[PDB]
Amino acid sequence: LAAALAQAL
């Protein structure tokens, strides 16, 4: 999940 969101950065 972290990665899935972190892609924004």
PDB file of C-alpha atoms in Angstrom:
ATOM      1  CA  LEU A   1       0.000   0.000   0.000  1.00  0.00           C
ATOM      2  CA  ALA A   2       2.777   2.447   0.881  1.00  0.00           C
ATOM      3  CA  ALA A   3       4.300   2.115  -2.600  1.00  0.00           C
ATOM      4  CA  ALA A   4       0.922   2.441  -4.247  1.00  0.00           C
ATOM      5  CA  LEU A   5       0.543   5.878  -2.672  1.00  0.00           C
ATOM      6  CA  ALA A   6       4.209   6.912  -2.684  1.00  0.00           C
ATOM      7  CA  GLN A   7       4.278   6.810  -6.463  1.00  0.00           C
ATOM      8  CA  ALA A   8       2.832  10.355  -6.251  1.00  0.00           C
ATOM      9  CA  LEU A   9       6.352  11.483  -5.241  1.00  0.00           C
TER      10      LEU A   9
END
